[PDB]
Amino acid sequence: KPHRYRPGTVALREIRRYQKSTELLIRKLPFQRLVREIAQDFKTDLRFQSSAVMALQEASEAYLVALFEDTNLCAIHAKRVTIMPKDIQLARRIRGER
Amino acid sequence: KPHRYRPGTVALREIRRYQKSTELLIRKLPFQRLVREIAQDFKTDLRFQSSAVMALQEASEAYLVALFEDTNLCAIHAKRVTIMPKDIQLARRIRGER
Amino acid sequence: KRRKTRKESYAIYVYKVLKQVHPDTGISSKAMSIMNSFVNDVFERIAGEASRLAHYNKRSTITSREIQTAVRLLLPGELAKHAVSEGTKAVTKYTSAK
Amino acid sequence: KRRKTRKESYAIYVYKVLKQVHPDTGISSKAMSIMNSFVNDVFERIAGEASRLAHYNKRSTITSREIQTAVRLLLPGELAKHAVSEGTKAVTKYTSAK
Amino acid sequence: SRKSMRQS
Amino acid sequence: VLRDNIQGITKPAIRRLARRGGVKRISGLIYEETRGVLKVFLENVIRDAVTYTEHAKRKTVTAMDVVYALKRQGRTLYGFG
Amino acid sequence: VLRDNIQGITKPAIRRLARRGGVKRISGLIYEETRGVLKVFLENVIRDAVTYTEHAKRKTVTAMDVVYALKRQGRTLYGFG
Amino acid sequence: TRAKAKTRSSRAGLQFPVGRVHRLLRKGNYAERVGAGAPVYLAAVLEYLTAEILELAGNAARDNKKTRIIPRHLQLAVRNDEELNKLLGRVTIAQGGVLPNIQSVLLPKK
Amino acid sequence: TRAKAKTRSSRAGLQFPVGRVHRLLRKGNYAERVGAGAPVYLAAVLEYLTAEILELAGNAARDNKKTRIIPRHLQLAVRNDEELNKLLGRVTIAQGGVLPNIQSVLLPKK
């Protein structure tokens, strides 16, 4: 019988690992491509500095992490341990973004 | 024999009435006394203009109405129709006040 | 017989605009004060955005294009484009006149 | 060939303060940039608050009192009082010397 | 006498 | 010296404020929490207003001081100057 | 012309972001909502940055433009000037 | 002799005061210099925003069978318009009340 | 002969540049005039805040067995101090990460 951790030990281990670490969690090239695709709609033939993309990635990851913390709090409020899109919608509505 | 409305008709009627209305819902004298008591801890022998107290009352009531809207949303999120102190705490935590 | 000091307000211009958009419609004192405060707040917002735009580009003059960029930054979409159209039309007419 | 145009930063002052508080602790380039941005942000906040204070009181000069009120309005609790004490001490010493 | 194109 | 004035925000007043906010059913423990939240908010706004008044060398808190205090906290209020 | 790059924010990336946020269990519909929210946020920030760049008559979006755009939206960022 | 005085608002075709806006910009500690077209442009933008809000408030007042704008009409006009609501999202209008909005879950199960 | 030059920072016993702060205040479009003691007071306040943050970051670095302050140490220092966290509530520190906070409901049952 192969060893298997129960469903939630590995999740907590990942939580600890990614709360201890500080490196960016999104791949750099896909994020740069997404940024360029979005910027194409605002002005054609735009160039981007590397520091600009790095700052955008940092801000986006920080915003997403804060949103996920709020979503986790909202899901815990509903006596759940699973985050759902309704939790994100409630968090963004209370924050005042919807 | 006496006529009695079911538990919630009058609540909806009051909701409609107070969303139609625009006058202040807190009594003027108790709120003024509270303002003076709070200001006593900051500076003694302070005087207040009437317009200042009216502005404070308007701001406080608007803030409380928005907080109660968020609290109602939180209570609905938890499959409830009753607001609880934990709902208020969650709303203020998501807003970024506590 | 001490005459009160001169307190400047946008009341007459707001009244003229109201008569332009609604000839048979009035405005109360509280609504006029609210509109004056709105005009002052928007003026402060746009002027501050233009000032920081000029500072960022190391310029000492607030020009029409700085105000245009401030309007584009601060207004939500269609409001921004219509405000830009009105501003450019007014500036063109003023330049054409003298 | 040609030296880059000089860009003023608070690096040396932050390093001196760090050596005062931690003689053996160093600082990374990113941490130094973060400290410089923090100093710039706090300077902008305090200067803007002092400017608004002067404008509200129809004053043309920003003095120690205006900055002190800006500090009291912007820094929370013990930070505000400690900053006030440090600043008043510095101003007293400066006026005592010349 | 004045109409805005935003409201059509 | 005033004291125990937070109780002046009565239960019907909090109920009316909740009704304006769309709340249909109110727990009995809502009132103390609402009083505490209102006290904290008023403490912050009044502290800022008193700081503004003291900077002006005035002894009367004006409506403009309250408006500036609210605007500093991102709560700009129209209708008072 | 770039297209369909929102799928570049992969499911493991969103899972890692949630783990850093403290989420223990993630629904399968969370990823699309997260991608949409990220797209909206990036659209706003990039729009402001491009406005700043165009005002400067430049064709390169700089880090300072991104910092100014974030500050205008109340999301001040430290470490990039 | 000197020519007849013409207001800059008349030249720009605007109702808002170009001269007052220019004086406020000069004395507002915004920049060392202020261009000629900046007050015209800002007055035009302010006039357009005022026209939008006043038109919506007049529509609200006519809906409420009133011939005079009160703060309630201004609040209804601002909150019923998505872009105006976003512009004044962090702004409280005195005596404006709130928009009628009851959640569907609280409605009676009819 | 003129007296030997002495920096205004040395007179106030400060490490931050009083003259540079004065120049930034004059050229920042904040007011028509700037007082003499205002740059001194602002430099003192900036120095105090920098000293507090640097002391906390050095303590964090020493707790992490490091001798050089990194963005993680600054983030820990800011978010662990209540007043500093309130001051920088809406500020994001690059490469700072987040605090190790796991909700008690998500922990395993003993």
Side-chain angles (χ1 to χ4, degrees):
Chain A
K1 189 59 171 170
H3 180 92
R4 284 190 61 89
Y5 288 107
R6 286 155 49 85
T9 304
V10 179
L12 286 156
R13 209 153 69 217
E14 285 174 74
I15 291 176
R16 293 186 175 97
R17 175 198 180 184
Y18 294 122
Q19 292 192 330
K20 182 180 169 54
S21 72
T22 60
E23 68 272 15
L24 288 183
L25 299 183
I26 306 181
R27 306 280 87 200
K28 296 204 295 183
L29 281 185
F31 188 86
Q32 182 166 200
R33 285 198 294 269
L34 175 66
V35 172
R36 293 180 189 276
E37 156 180 327
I38 291 177
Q40 274 169 17
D41 294 325
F42 302 126
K43 178 186 180 188
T44 55
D45 303 320
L46 270 172
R47 297 166 96 82
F48 276 85
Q49 289 184 359
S50 293
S51 50
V53 177
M54 295 313 299
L56 277 175
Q57 200 170 349
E58 285 285 345
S60 307
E61 293 206 15
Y63 168 80
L64 284 179
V65 166
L67 183 53
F68 274 133
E69 300 182 348
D70 286 341
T71 300
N72 202 28
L73 286 176
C74 297
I76 292 168
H77 189 79
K79 304 176 176 308
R80 289 188 275 100
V81 302
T82 318
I83 59 159
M84 307 189 74
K86 65 172 83 168
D87 306 320
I88 286 185
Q89 293 160 19
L90 174 74
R92 293 185 73 247
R93 167 62 175 80
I94 295 168
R95 280 175 165 198
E97 304 173 8
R98 313 198 312 144
Chain B
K1 305 172 192 171
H3 177 94
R4 280 191 70 90
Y5 285 108
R6 285 155 54 77
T9 305
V10 186
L12 288 160
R13 207 150 69 208
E14 290 169 15
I15 288 171
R16 294 182 182 105
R17 166 190 173 182
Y18 292 121
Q19 288 183 345
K20 260 193 178 193
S21 71
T22 57
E23 86 282 354
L24 297 169
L25 305 173
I26 307 183
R27 300 286 92 183
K28 312 302 188 50
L29 283 188
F31 190 86
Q32 181 171 188
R33 286 196 302 266
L34 172 67
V35 170
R36 299 184 179 276
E37 177 198 290
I38 291 179
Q40 269 155 38
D41 303 317
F42 303 136
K43 190 180 180 302
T44 62
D45 299 355
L46 267 188
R47 287 170 166 243
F48 283 83
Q49 293 193 341
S50 310
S51 50
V53 176
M54 297 323 291
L56 275 171
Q57 200 171 345
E58 292 272 1
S60 297
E61 289 195 12
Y63 171 75
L64 286 183
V65 169
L67 183 55
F68 275 128
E69 275 165 56
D70 292 347
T71 298
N72 200 28
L73 289 189
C74 292
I76 294 168
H77 189 82
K79 298 291 180 68
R80 297 188 270 95
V81 295
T82 304
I83 61 163
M84 298 181 70
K86 70 203 206 72
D87 308 319
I88 280 183
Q89 289 155 13
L90 176 73
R92 289 184 74 239
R93 163 65 183 83
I94 302 301
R95 282 172 161 201
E97 307 175 353
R98 58 187 299 271
Chain C
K1 298 189 167 193
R2 178 72 272 172
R3 196 188 187 90
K4 299 180 182 60
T5 187
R6 163 173 290 95
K7 292 189 165 192
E8 295 187 334
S9 72
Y10 297 99
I12 54 164
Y13 319 105
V14 174
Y15 196 79
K16 289 172 186 170
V17 171
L18 174 61
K19 283 313 167 181
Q20 285 196 334
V21 301
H22 286 290
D24 303 315
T25 301
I27 182 161
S28 66
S29 70
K30 280 298 299 203
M32 182 56 82
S33 186
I34 290 165
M35 282 305 303
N36 192 68
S37 51
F38 164 76
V39 175
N40 280 312
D41 183 26
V42 167
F43 178 98
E44 292 179 353
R45 288 196 226 179
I46 298 177
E49 187 50 56
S51 171
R52 63 180 61 99
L53 272 163
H55 179 80
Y56 292 160
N57 299 274
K58 286 154 51 62
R59 297 275 184 267
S60 312
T61 310
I62 288 180
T63 64
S64 302
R65 77 185 306 267
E66 269 93 5
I67 296 298
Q68 184 177 6
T69 304
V71 170
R72 285 185 50 209
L73 284 162
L74 297 162
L75 296 196
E78 293 293 290
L79 269 192
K81 68 170 45 61
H82 286 68
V84 163
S85 176
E86 294 300 289
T88 59
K89 176 189 58 190
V91 169
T92 294
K93 179 168 192 296
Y94 171 84
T95 306
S96 81
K98 282 186 183 182
Chain D
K1 189 264 182 182
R2 160 177 266 196
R3 320 220 295 167
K4 319 179 165 66
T5 305
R6 52 186 41 175
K7 181 186 193 61
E8 286 178 0
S9 70
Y10 291 100
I12 61 175
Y13 317 109
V14 170
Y15 201 83
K16 285 166 176 177
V17 173
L18 174 62
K19 285 321 180 177
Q20 275 177 345
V21 302
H22 285 279
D24 51 328
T25 298
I27 189 174
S28 68
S29 64
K30 262 291 186 159
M32 181 59 79
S33 171
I34 290 160
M35 287 309 298
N36 186 58
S37 80
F38 164 76
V39 171
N40 279 307
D41 183 21
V42 172
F43 178 98
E44 283 177 334
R45 287 195 230 179
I46 294 175
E49 194 54 58
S51 181
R52 266 177 256 117
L53 280 161
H55 188 76
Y56 295 158
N57 289 278
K58 297 163 309 168
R59 290 299 162 90
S60 301
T61 312
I62 287 185
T63 62
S64 305
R65 190 171 184 268
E66 270 93 344
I67 300 286
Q68 162 161 318
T69 305
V71 168
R72 284 197 176 121
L73 286 169
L74 294 165
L75 303 186
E78 302 304 275
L79 276 184
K81 68 169 50 60
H82 285 68
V84 160
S85 67
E86 292 300 276
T88 59
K89 184 222 306 171
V91 170
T92 288
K93 174 155 171 30
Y94 174 76
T95 63
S96 80
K98 283 186 183 182
Chain E
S1 188
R2 182 178 189 143
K3 286 195 176 187
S4 173
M5 296 296 179
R6 198 172 71 103
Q7 288 80 11
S8 82
Chain F
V1 175
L2 285 168
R3 83 289 181 275
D4 194 60
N5 299 268
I6 194 62
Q7 293 303 138
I9 298 91
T10 66
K11 165 183 190 286
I14 299 174
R15 288 176 69 85
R16 290 194 290 275
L17 289 168
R19 295 287 185 261
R20 181 164 290 177
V23 172
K24 184 186 182 176
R25 207 163 185 271
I26 303 170
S27 177
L29 297 177
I30 295 296
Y31 308 111
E32 283 303 312
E33 194 80 15
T34 306
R35 288 182 184 102
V37 169
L38 172 67
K39 210 189 71 168
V40 170
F41 171 83
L42 276 185
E43 277 178 327
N44 296 346
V45 182
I46 289 173
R47 183 198 301 107
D48 288 355
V50 175
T51 302
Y52 277 112
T53 301
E54 289 173 336
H55 179 75
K57 293 171 186 170
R58 281 192 270 95
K59 301 185 169 185
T60 299
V61 186
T62 62
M64 286 296 195
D65 295 336
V66 171
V67 167
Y68 296 149
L70 289 163
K71 175 177 161 193
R72 217 197 54 77
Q73 302 174 6
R75 295 183 203 278
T76 304
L77 170 79
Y78 291 174
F80 292 93
Chain G
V1 173
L2 282 176
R3 82 289 181 275
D4 193 56
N5 296 290
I6 190 60
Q7 302 304 317
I9 315 299
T10 62
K11 167 180 174 178
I14 296 155
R15 286 177 72 81
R16 288 192 293 268
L17 291 165
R19 293 295 189 240
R20 177 167 288 166
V23 171
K24 193 190 178 178
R25 199 175 156 96
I26 311 170
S27 178
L29 298 171
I30 278 286
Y31 310 112
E32 282 306 314
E33 184 81 20
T34 305
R35 287 185 192 109
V37 168
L38 176 63
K39 203 188 194 308
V40 160
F41 174 80
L42 280 173
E43 272 156 2
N44 296 328
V45 180
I46 288 170
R47 184 196 297 107
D48 286 359
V50 174
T51 293
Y52 277 113
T53 297
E54 279 165 337
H55 176 74
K57 292 172 178 183
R58 288 185 275 100
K59 302 160 175 295
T60 303
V61 181
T62 63
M64 280 331 285
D65 297 329
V66 177
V67 171
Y68 297 150
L70 290 167
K71 161 176 286 304
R72 217 200 56 83
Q73 302 188 163
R75 299 185 199 279
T76 310
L77 182 60
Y78 285 3
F80 287 95
Chain H
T1 53
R2 211 167 72 186
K4 190 56 170 63
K6 289 178 50 55
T7 76
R8 293 192 271 178
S9 304
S10 72
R11 304 186 196 267
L14 302 175
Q15 306 299 323
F16 268 50
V18 174
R20 179 178 299 189
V21 165
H22 184 75
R23 186 250 303 167
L24 288 179
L25 282 168
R26 278 192 284 97
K27 302 191 185 308
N29 301 114
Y30 296 113
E32 184 189 86
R33 294 143 52 88
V34 176
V40 178
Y41 196 89
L42 188 49
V45 173
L46 290 171
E47 170 167 334
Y48 164 76
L49 289 184
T50 298
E52 281 290 296
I53 292 178
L54 283 184
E55 188 272 331
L56 290 177
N59 291 335
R62 190 208 325 111
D63 294 333
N64 296 268
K65 279 77 185 177
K66 306 293 173 186
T67 62
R68 188 178 296 161
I69 292 174
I70 64 177
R72 173 60 164 177
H73 306 143
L74 291 174
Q75 171 91 333
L76 292 176
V78 167
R79 303 312 164 187
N80 277 316
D81 189 81
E82 175 195 357
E83 283 166 336
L84 280 182
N85 175 60
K86 194 184 308 170
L87 180 65
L88 301 188
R90 307 297 163 167
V91 178
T92 296
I93 289 182
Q95 287 299 288
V98 299
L99 265 287
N101 176 259
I102 306 173
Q103 301 295 306
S104 68
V105 65
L106 307 186
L107 297 185
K109 311 303 168 178
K110 300 177 187 170
Chain I
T1 50
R2 74 163 46 169
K4 175 57 172 295
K6 192 145 50 64
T7 65
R8 280 190 273 167
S9 281
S10 71
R11 299 177 190 272
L14 299 182
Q15 307 297 314
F16 264 53
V18 172
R20 174 180 291 184
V21 163
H22 181 73
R23 182 243 306 168
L24 292 170
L25 283 177
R26 283 191 288 97
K27 289 180 185 172
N29 293 311
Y30 298 118
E32 198 190 80
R33 304 135 50 81
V34 182
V40 168
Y41 189 84
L42 188 41
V45 166
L46 293 174
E47 180 172 350
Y48 161 78
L49 291 168
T50 298
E52 282 299 319
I53 291 176
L54 284 183
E55 190 273 331
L56 291 173
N59 294 344
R62 194 190 54 242
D63 291 339
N64 304 141
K65 274 73 179 171
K66 299 304 188 306
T67 62
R68 290 214 291 258
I69 289 167
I70 62 163
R72 174 60 168 180
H73 303 148
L74 293 171
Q75 169 89 336
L76 291 178
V78 170
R79 305 306 162 190
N80 284 325
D81 195 7
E82 193 274 332
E83 291 173 323
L84 283 179
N85 174 73
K86 193 175 311 156
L87 175 63
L88 308 184
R90 73 279 191 190
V91 172
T92 297
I93 293 175
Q95 287 293 294
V98 302
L99 273 294
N101 180 250
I102 300 173
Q103 299 293 125
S104 70
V105 65
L106 307 181
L107 294 170
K109 312 176 187 181
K110 295 180 173 180

